[PDB]
Structures are given as structure tokens and as C-alpha cells.
Design a binder for these strands. Sequence first.
RNA 1: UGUAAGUGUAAAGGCAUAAGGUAGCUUAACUGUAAGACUGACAAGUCGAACAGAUACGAAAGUAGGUCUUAGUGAUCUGGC
RNA 2: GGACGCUGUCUCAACGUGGAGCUCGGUGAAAUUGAAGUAUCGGUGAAGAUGCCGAUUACUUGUGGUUAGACGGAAAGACCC
RNA 3: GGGACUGACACCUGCCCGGUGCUGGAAGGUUAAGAGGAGAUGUUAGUUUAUGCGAAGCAUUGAAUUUAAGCCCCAGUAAAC
RNA 4: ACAUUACCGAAGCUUUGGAUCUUAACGAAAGUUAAGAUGGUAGGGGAGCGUUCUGUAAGCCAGAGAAGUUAAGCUGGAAAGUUUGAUGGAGGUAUCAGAAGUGAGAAUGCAGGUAUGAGUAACGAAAAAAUGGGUGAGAUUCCCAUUCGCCGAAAACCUAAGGUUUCCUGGGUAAAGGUCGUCUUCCCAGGGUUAGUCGGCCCCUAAGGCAAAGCUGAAAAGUGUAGUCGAUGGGAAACGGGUU
RNA 5: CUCUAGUCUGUUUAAAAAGGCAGGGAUGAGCUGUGAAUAGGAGUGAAAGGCUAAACAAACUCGGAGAUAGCUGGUUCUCCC
RNA 6: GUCUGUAAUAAGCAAAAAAGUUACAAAAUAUUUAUAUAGAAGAAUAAUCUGGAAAGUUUAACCAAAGAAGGUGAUAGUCCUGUAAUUUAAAUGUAAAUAUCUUUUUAAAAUGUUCCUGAGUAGGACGAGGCACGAGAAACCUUGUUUGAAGCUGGGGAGACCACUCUCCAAGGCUAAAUACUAGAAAGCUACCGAUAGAGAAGAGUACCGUGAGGGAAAGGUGAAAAGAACCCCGGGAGGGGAGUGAAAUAGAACUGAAACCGUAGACUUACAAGCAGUCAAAGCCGUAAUUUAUUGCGGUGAUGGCGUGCCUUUUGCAUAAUGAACCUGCGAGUUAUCAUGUCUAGCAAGAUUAAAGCAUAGAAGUGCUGGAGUCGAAGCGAAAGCGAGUCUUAAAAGGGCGAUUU
RNA 7: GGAGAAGCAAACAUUUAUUGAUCCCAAGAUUACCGAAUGGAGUAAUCCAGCUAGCAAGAUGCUAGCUAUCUAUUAUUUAAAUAAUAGAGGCGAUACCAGGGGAAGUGAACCAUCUAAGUACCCUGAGGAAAAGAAAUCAAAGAGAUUCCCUUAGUAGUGGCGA
Lengths: 66, 156, 114
Amino acid sequence: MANKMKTRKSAKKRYSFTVNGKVKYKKQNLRHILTKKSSKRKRNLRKSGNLSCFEVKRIKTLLPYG
Amino acid sequence: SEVRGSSKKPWKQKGTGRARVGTKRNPVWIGGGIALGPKPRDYSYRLPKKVKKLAFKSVLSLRAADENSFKVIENFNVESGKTKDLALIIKNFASFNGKVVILLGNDDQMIKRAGKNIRDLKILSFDKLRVVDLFYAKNLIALESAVNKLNEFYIK
Amino acid sequence: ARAKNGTVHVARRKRILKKTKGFWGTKKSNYKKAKDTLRKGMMYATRDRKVRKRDFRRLWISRISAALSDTGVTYSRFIEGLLKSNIKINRKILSNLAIEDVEAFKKIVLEIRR
RNA sequence: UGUAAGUGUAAAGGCAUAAGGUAGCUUAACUGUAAGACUGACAAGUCGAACAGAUACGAAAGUAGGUCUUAGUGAUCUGGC
RNA sequence: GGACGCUGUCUCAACGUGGAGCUCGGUGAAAUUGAAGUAUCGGUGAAGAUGCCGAUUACUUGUGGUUAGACGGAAAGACCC
RNA sequence: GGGACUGACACCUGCCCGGUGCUGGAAGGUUAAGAGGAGAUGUUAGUUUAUGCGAAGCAUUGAAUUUAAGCCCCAGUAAAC
RNA sequence: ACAUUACCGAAGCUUUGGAUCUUAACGAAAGUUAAGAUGGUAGGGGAGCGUUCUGUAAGCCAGAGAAGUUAAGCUGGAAAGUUUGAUGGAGGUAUCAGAAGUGAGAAUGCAGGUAUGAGUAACGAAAAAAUGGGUGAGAUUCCCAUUCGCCGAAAACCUAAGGUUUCCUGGGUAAAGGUCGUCUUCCCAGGGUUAGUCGGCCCCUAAGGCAAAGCUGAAAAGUGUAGUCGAUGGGAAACGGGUU
RNA sequence: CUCUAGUCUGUUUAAAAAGGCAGGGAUGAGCUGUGAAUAGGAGUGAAAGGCUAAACAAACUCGGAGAUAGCUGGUUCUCCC
RNA sequence: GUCUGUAAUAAGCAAAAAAGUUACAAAAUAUUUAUAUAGAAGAAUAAUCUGGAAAGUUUAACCAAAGAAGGUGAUAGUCCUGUAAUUUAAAUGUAAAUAUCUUUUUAAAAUGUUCCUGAGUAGGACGAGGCACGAGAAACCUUGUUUGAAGCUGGGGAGACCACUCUCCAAGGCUAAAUACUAGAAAGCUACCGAUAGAGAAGAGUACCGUGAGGGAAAGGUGAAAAGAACCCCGGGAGGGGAGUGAAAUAGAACUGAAACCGUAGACUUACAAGCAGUCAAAGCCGUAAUUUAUUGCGGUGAUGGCGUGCCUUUUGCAUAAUGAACCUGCGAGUUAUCAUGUCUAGCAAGAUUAAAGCAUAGAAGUGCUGGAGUCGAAGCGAAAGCGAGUCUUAAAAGGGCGAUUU
RNA sequence: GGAGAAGCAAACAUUUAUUGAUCCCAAGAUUACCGAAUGGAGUAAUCCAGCUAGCAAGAUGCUAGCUAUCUAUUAUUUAAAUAAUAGAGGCGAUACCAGGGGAAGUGAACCAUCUAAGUACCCUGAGGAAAAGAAAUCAAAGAGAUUCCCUUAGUAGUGGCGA
């Protein structure tokens, strides 16, 4: 209790965990200038995605409890 | 940081012709501190109670497997509290010239303080057993009171 | 829990000094020079154990060539006839034969020249 | 003679069924999606049949989710509508 | 910057004097040091060799001198980045 | 009495006030806190068939008006930079 | 240069043993055979040696000789291990389990000891020594005598600032003296400093410090008057000779 | 009596800045004795980035402190894959 | 109860309780075999062997509420000091309990009327601080500069604010225990150190260094007992050679005495030679053992031949003339506490497990029960409400994302 | 408590102790001078005194006893001034506690917000503990002062929403 590992809050506010490992996240580029972007591009940016399996280990280190 | 002395740099960084140094109590230097030495720490820990219970059952079975080293004696007591009487009883039973552990079914203070002084004797109540003493005991002498109390103690 | 007892380094050093007995100068007593010279010596020992085979075979060949200088058989031709007439005797054996009992070796040569 | 011309804009790849030129009507320069892929450290980028809603043109089959294609772009946080 | 006088500054060095140096007796350091039955030349190689190759030369060991080398000693280059 | 620059003495010390400083001057342009509460917002007794509106109280707010120095501006000053 | 037949030549290959691992087969397993595969920095995995301490251990091995060092011999695939002599004169160790301040050749590492240069440079200013006698185990160096040389607005004499017994007498040569030493400012013991006039103390103030009150500051304190200290200054008084 | 131009010696020095030849001032902006005063972002400075206890482009002592180094150095028994 | 005597209440006296730990304060006593600062008593071995010496070997006992630990000529339960369980207090300190004494009540419930119930205070505005909360919609608390109320028909708080409702009563002052700490005094424990370790210091803040603040070492061991060498000999002494003491005199001012380093003696080799000094072959000579005996082995030296660019760092690459070490001996570097995750082992199992803490036992920082507060699993999806083996996206299981029924 | 003792250590002499020593515990006496140092001063361990008393008192003689400051309380027109008492001054504890002041080396791979951290240090106060403490409290549960552990929980929030 003297040394509980602290979670990385800025990472907690962006990452989420699925039941068996994968990481859910919100896609970028849908926050700002949006008139020029094509409609199908924007529609795909709206829907949430899953990260590549290469970041999952580092993310599991960043979120020691969540 | 706990060795007595000053934290002044013993001599200048460059130009003296000696090896660089920061403080006199450098762990390298003689009389200095000690890098990665021992510090006070808590060595105690508590095993799961089920594992502890299973160990007790196992050591008791292992001891009772042998007919001669394990023996059972009818209830008695040393009403005088002397040591001669108890020592006579052990030296009548015990044969393997070594550690003898007596098991009791209660807290019979007279027996306990009569046996506190025997050479290789350990008196234990049924509800305060110690696995090390049981495991290394070469003679194990139990009362039938202790046997019955052990039966309902560890059947549960 | 201090674990200091230094009956180890003296032991290493005593074994090394025992093996490095006859060396020149300070290489026989100092720990550092004795260890350096011993370690290079053992590697030399391995290399030379493999080289001794080459050295001795070369010696045997030279001895055979010398024992044949009398007759007119160059020993390349001697090995030739030796194989061709199917005599599977050895270089060491022939070299020793030419010294212990020269006439047997000479008879072998007369027999090869066929 | 047979694309050497011309394709808003550099160059390249294409363009006769024309993607070039002209005229009529018109707003698909759409909403929800998207099997399957290309390219890719990651973040991203790109193509996409087909389905529901509702249009434009056409007799219809069908085409249209901006521009012949590939450059004209900017993450997150903060704030405004 | 020039001139006079004066001179071993020089042509051009020589001799003498005092303290060291040299020998013996007494006292007795130093930086330095992987050690060492540590030659030269033409080569070779982390591109300048006591240590490698080929060849040449050289009895063993000291002392007084001399610094060409051991990229000599001394100061974790001050210049440059 | 303090500061700046020059440095006995002799003859002299020319031109430039745009730039940047310093001195003086407020007619305007601009400008903070403090006064000033147009108006807007939340709450609700009540009204409204009810929403909507919504008095008073309690709060969150804010414009037009007022306002100093400074800056812009108007001059002077070089043995001021 | 072109032909014929050879030989030499590596840790390559073959042959002769021996070790481990993987796979496959045999085998009840254990293991036995068939095949191949075992250079290696950074780096990953596995198996061991040795050291200290605790339990096992109120055990076992030691005064008939324990640990430790030392000599010879022997053994294991490596860390390493155990037998016998000599030394040593009092504590160690087998099996299993546990815990680390657990293994050193280097950090211009730290500490101690000892080499090297080397019996080499130096022995601290170009004022200078010589002989005789004496003392003594021992004399270029100490004492005395006779000569010589040096300083002489000093290298002489007397008081400060400073040191603190270094002063005198007797005794001594571990060490210290850049050599020697009977000598010394070195060591040991004892002795030695006598004030109305000298210098202080004291009565005075300068530079300056402190400072009730007053004033100002988170605190500590800072300014600051009356007062009090503060000589390098101003203030009563002695000279000559002799003596250890 | 005070300072150090020129030159030499010294340079593992007799001396952690001196010594031998000499030189400048020497009735004054002179030299010197004994006290006292000014302290670290401060003092003092006839002005050299000089001096403030042999070290000053920000003293020394203790403490934060085992400051931090993307830099340099070191990191101890064995065998098998 | 303004004065006197009457219906009508207060100031004092019977009747009880609390108190120096807050709740009023000040003590004095005796009383307590309560305790602290000295003490008292305290169990039970002889022989034999080796040896300088016995406690040890061997054979037999004996004590034990005492086999904790030291010393004694080698290793002691029974030799000594002590240890277990008991116990000494005239005097003093500290504790309780008892009364002395002290103070207080000399009463309580019963209904509405006017009064009182903490003011420059609550709060507001501005500038700051403390709340985990950095102005953010910023509550709450403290406050400097200013302004400023209500008075129970009241006021505060409930994370801007308002309403209703709910809770509490500020602007007065006190309070033991659970807690934190040990320079120290007493009694102990140790998988803590054993003289480069442990406190800097086994002899010390000393020697020494600095004007000062301050910095700061090194040096332990004769034997069981001085029994410290009578006396003689060489020598000025020192030192040594005998004689004595001792088990040992290379124990004689010091146990064991290694390596670096310095020697002496003997064996062999070396003055025609170019050697990271070693390795592989190898005659002669010396020592020793065999085979009857001059040939083999093991040993030591070694003429001569082949091969051979120290080691460690750092580098594309080092014999490198790149770095580092004079040599030897000691010391000198992935450790500890917690959390995350993986593996191994052990136990239980859709369940696993206690944390703090309490009691018993004895004094023996144990281990046995008790302790289910909590944590991780058992359901997911979505920003969330909400719905759930489904859910999100949308009207659409229409298709997808994440799930799963297969733990 | 009982037979040696003259410290930490004996030497080599000379006494003490059974008339109960040495030693240990408790009380008491003595207790030079300096130091908060306090009669004034000062270069701490030393000068200068006043008043009273005793030494033949006396000429810079000696020994004793008083004469510092601050706060509170009264004897006063608490101020000025004494007087009367009571309590403070300094040290320790290179620990703990409360209050006041309050960094920086660092991390954010710069750095200024932020961090380090209310830590180091300084200053003023106390105590055996200190501080806090008997709701104008928590917070949506119905609990009932303060303080210290276990959990909630590395959660809620917060942050150049970066560390």
C-alpha cells in the first residue's frame, strides 16, 4: 500500500479494454475542420475502432488496474 | 548518508592527479557506507489456513505410520510438579536417544512446568501444535486425551 | 549474514601457482602475470596437441624420403607402387622400419619397384 | 494525314465507346451502412460490389456518395455556434 | 629609426677562477613502472614496429657522456565539435 | 553637493532633431480599477385549460454613459545616444 | 604454353575411441541401439561447484592434535574435491531444507605492506678553516689553547609583537639533527621569574562597540538619546653599583 | 625605507612567486606600527574581470545531497542448448 | 420579601453525594508484602585413561519451577559467579484504595405570556491562501483591504444558484485514554558485526589541519599462571650465546605468520647469441623406482627444432605508437520494501482469501482459534440513461463492432 | 554486607579495618571560580565596587549577606517611582509537537504554469506527549466529540487534461 502503482490518467481517459484483450478507442480527425472531408470518410471516422495488436502490451503496462 | 562525516568533495575534480570522488563516505572508500547492504525487514508471513491444516494432518499421519517411534500413554499427571517423575516416565518410554515431543489434551500446568527443563523434551498442547517439532521429533508420546481432542480438532 | 571468509582467492591462486612452476622471472610467483601466462599456455597446449600430428607425419615423410635417397625411386613413386601393389603399411611404421631393420625396408622397396 | 489537337492547374499514366466539344434538364458536391481488400511500425490513408430511405437524368436498362486519375493540407487539448 | 664612443654580440674561439659534475666514506629521494634471454634494414599492419615477415648485423656485463626513438614523463586538450 | 563625458597648455570644436532618449505642452484618438445598471439569464407565489408568460425576493451577468497617467500626437534639445 | 602419371598439403572427409542432447525404434521402466548435431559476441533458456549463517545438531568428528597456511601425490567433463607428511595449539563438519553484505585482475578504485628508478639526484647559498691537548668504548664535528677568516647602520647590544620552559645544573643517545657525536633549542629529573616608582590594573577619552527610553520591523532583530566600555594617546613617584 | 622596468639563475626550486646584477620614487597622491569599520549577488576597487585568509566572471563551512548526467569508466564461479 | 405585625417567597441550620485527569482548590495522614532506587537464600559427581593442565575419553550416578549465559590451565546441569520459583526497605520517589478533609444539592415535575441566548460577527465586493480540487458553473474554511445583517415569526449547512423539504445552533472557554518520539536508565532477544568489519572512536572528537565556522585519523591478541630470564660469556650499549622458568623461549613485549619483497646453501644450465618468454618435440647431466643392471618410467634442469603480435576496455577494424593497472594482500557494484503482469510449486474450487484487531497459552518479536470489514472471479454492451446472452450504431439481427454456447 | 581496603592498574613503602572498614542504596553537609550570570564592567574562570555585620579597621586588606531585567497581581493619581509577592530567563533530545517564514539541485527528457514541497532550513512557543476535540458535523446513510490503524482506492475528481 506504500507503493501502489499509479495509473496513467491521460491514457485511462482514452483507452478501453474488451473482455479478452483487445483495446477499444475513438478514431482521430473528427474533431475539427470537417467540411472538406468526404462523407464516407467522416462516417467511418465516427464509428469506434480497435487498436493494432502491437500496442496492447504497452497499454497494459500503462493501465495497471483497468 | 548515515555514516558520520561531511559531504564535502575531498579534492578538486580536475588537476590533482587522483581518481574523481564525491564524498569521503563513498561505498568504494574504506570506512564508507555500504551499497545494497541489509536493512530491517519483516520476514513473517501467514500461510493459507487450509494448507496449514493439511500440513498438520500430513505430519501427524507420517509420524503415526511408524509403530515404535509413536506411542500413546494413558492419562496421568505429575501432581508434585517435580522433574524426577516426568523424566522417569520419558526414560521408560523413549528409545531413540533424541528429541522427544509430548502431546497433551489440555493445559496441564504441572506437567508443562515439570517438563520445561528436560534435556530434549518439547511439551505441546493439542491446539498449539508446531509442525517443525512434530516433524523432527524422533519420539512422539501422546495422551489419549490429546488423541480425542485432536480427532475433533482436525475432523472439522 | 556477512559472508566474508576469504579461503577462496588463495585457493585459486595456489592452484595456478602450482601449475606455473618453472616459468621465467616474475611469471612464476605473481598472481596476475602467472594467470596471463598460464591461460595463453593452455590455449597453446590445445593448438599444439592438434599440430603434433602434422609435425610427426612430416617427420616420417622426410625420414622415408631420406632412406630412399640411395635407390632410384622418388618416394612419390614409392607411395605410388605401394598403393598399386596394395601394401597398406603406415608412414610411421615404414619410418621406424628404415631405422630398426634397414634390409626389410629395402626389400619392400625392391618389391614396390615392380 | 489519323490524335501529333484538346483535357482549369506541374508532370506522368490514360483518354475514339472518347475522360475531348455542344445542348437540355438538374443538385448524388445525399442519410444509415458496408461483404471483401490494397497499402501499411503505429497513428492513418485508399478502393469497394451490394442493402434500406429519399432524389436527379433516362422510354428503359441503368448511372450519379463531387471534379480523367494521382498534390490544394494539420493530431490532441482548449474555446465558440 | 639614425649617429658617436665603447666593447668576445660577432669573424672565432682560447685560457684561467668559484660552486656542481667525476672517485671514495656517511645519510639517502623523486616522478615513473603489464612484465623484458627491448638490435638494424626493406616491407606488412588501426595507414610512422624493440615484439610480425624476409634478410643483415651483433661475445657476456658495467661506467662516464649524448637525447634520435620508445607517437617519452607531467596535466580525463585549453584549440575544434 | 551628485552624475556623465573629455583630459595641462595653444589654436579650434563645422552640418543634421528624421531614428532612439531627455525636457516642456494637452486640443483630440485610445485606455484600467471605481461609479452607472439599457438589457439578458436561473429559480417560482400566481396567472395561463396547461405549456408559455411569470410580480416580488434571492442570485449570475452586463452595454450606452462617465473618468488619470501612459502611448499616439505637438515642439525643443546633439560638449544627448 | 600445351599433354601423361603422381605426391605433399587444414581442426574439411574417412578410421579409432569417449561425452552430452534431440528424434526414432526396442525395452515393463530404467536403459540399450539407428540416425544427426553440438564455433560463437550482444541476448534468451537449462543444469551445477564453492562461501557464510540458521534448523536438522544436547547429533558426529577434535587435545591420541580442530580451523588456518604449507609440501607431495591422486580424482572429476568445469567450477573444484580428498588422502598423507611438516607447522599449528582450539574449535570444525556429512545429508536435507532455508536465507544472502555469497565468488574480483583492472573503475587515472580505497587502505596497508613492499619493489622499481638506485645506492642514483641531493645533503639548502662561492664568510674558511688548521694544529695540539683533554674527555671518552668510540672524535674532521664536543671542551679548552694558539693561529686564520667573516659581520661590524651587524651577522653586535637592549626593549616589543609572538612563542611558553625552549632558561640553569646533573644525567642520557630508541628516535628527531639531511653525516658523525661524549654534543644539541632532543629526551629525563630537579631548580629558576621577588616591584609603592618598569609594563599593566586604575582614573580619562579618540576610532569604534554595546545600549534603558523613543522609533521602526512576520520572528530573529534594525536604528538610536541618556549611560558604559574601548590605546596605538593623555594621567602621582628611583637612580648608581654589587651579587647568583 | 619602500616598490619591480631590463636581464640571468631558479623551474621533481633555498623560496606554493624568491635570489644575483640592477632599476624607479625618496618633503609626499609618501612609507610604516598598533586598533577599529565595510561580507557573497554583497564589500572594496587612481578600474586589471583586480582583491576579499596561497583557489574569485560571484569566497569558505555545514545542510538539501547518495543533486542531476542521452557522457566516460567499472561490474567477481563453471558448464550445456 | 424598602419599615412593624398578618395570607406570600427568598438569606442561613437538619437531610446526601462528588472531587484534584476536564468537570472548585489546598494538603496531611496512617494505611498496600503495591512498586522503583541497595540486598537475602538458592538444588545436586566420584573414579579411571591420555595430557603441562580435564570440564574431555570410559564406567556409574545425582539435581532439575534451576540443561539462560559467563568464568575456571582443553568442551562443566551438579567447581565458582549466577539462572528457576521465591523474597529485604529504617529513608526517599511514584502509584492506587481507605477514611481525614474539601465542595456541592439544602427540590422536582408541571402552561403561556414579555426578556435573554456570544456584532463590526454571519454574509457581500476585491486581492491571496488552505481544501486532492491549478477560476473552472467553484461550494466550504482561514484571511488582508472595505462594506455590512437578522435577533427564533430567527439563523447556518446540504460542491454555482433558487424554491420546497431535511439536518444543525456560529461569532466563549476547557478535557484523560487509543497516537507520535527515546538523547537516555533497567532487564533481555539476534539465520546482527568480530578489529580495512562494528559507532568517527574496543585507546577519540584525541593526534593533526584551518584565522574561524569546521574537518578529522591510525594503533586489539605473550602464557594457564610473570613463573619478566638468578648467574656466566662476547659487546660501550643494543643484540646474542649458555644456564634457568615454562607444555612450548624459531611464546623473551609477543598467538596462527600467507603473498608481494630480501637472502644463504646445493643440483643443473648460461659469455656466436635476436626468446609476449609459453607450448609441442628432444640429447646430455642430476635425484629416485623398477627390470640383476644398463635400458625403461616418474621428477628437476635443460643444448637444439617447429609454432606463437600480453591482458582488459572501447571499436567497421587494436600487437597496436588508443584506454587502464608498479607488485601483493584485504575491502569494493541488479539489493530491499510494495504494486502491476507472466511462469513454477502448494491448497481449495464457482468459488478463493482475510486486513486491521481480539482472546487463550507461555514469556516463548511464537502459533492456535476468533475476526468476511474488504479484494478478485461469477455477464456483457454502450459516452450514458437504460437494456442484458445479448448490446451498441440506426427505423432496420440488414449488416457490422464488441461479445458468447464451449466456463 | 561482612573482611579486606587506599579509584580506573600494579609496582614500593607506610598506614587504616572485627570498637564492623572499603563498597552499595537513601537523606543531609561542604560545594573554589566561570557560565542564563543577574551589583557595574569585561579579553568566560577577573577587575571595580556600594550598604550592613565580624576581623586591633586603617591606609585600593580579608570573610560573609543583599543591590539585573521582564510579565502578572496590589500600596498608591496600575502611568513616573519604588514596595510587596508569584512566575519566567538558560540548557537538553543532531527526536517527537504547534505556530510564523519558506527554498533550490530535480522531473516535465528544453522550460515559465506544474513538480520536488509545505520537504530542507531558520524563528517563536510548549508538553510528557503536543495538537485536535463534545456538531451552526457528516452526508442521502441514519448515524452521533476528537485522535490513531484497516479498507473504500490508486477509485471519485484534478492536471501546459502534459508530467
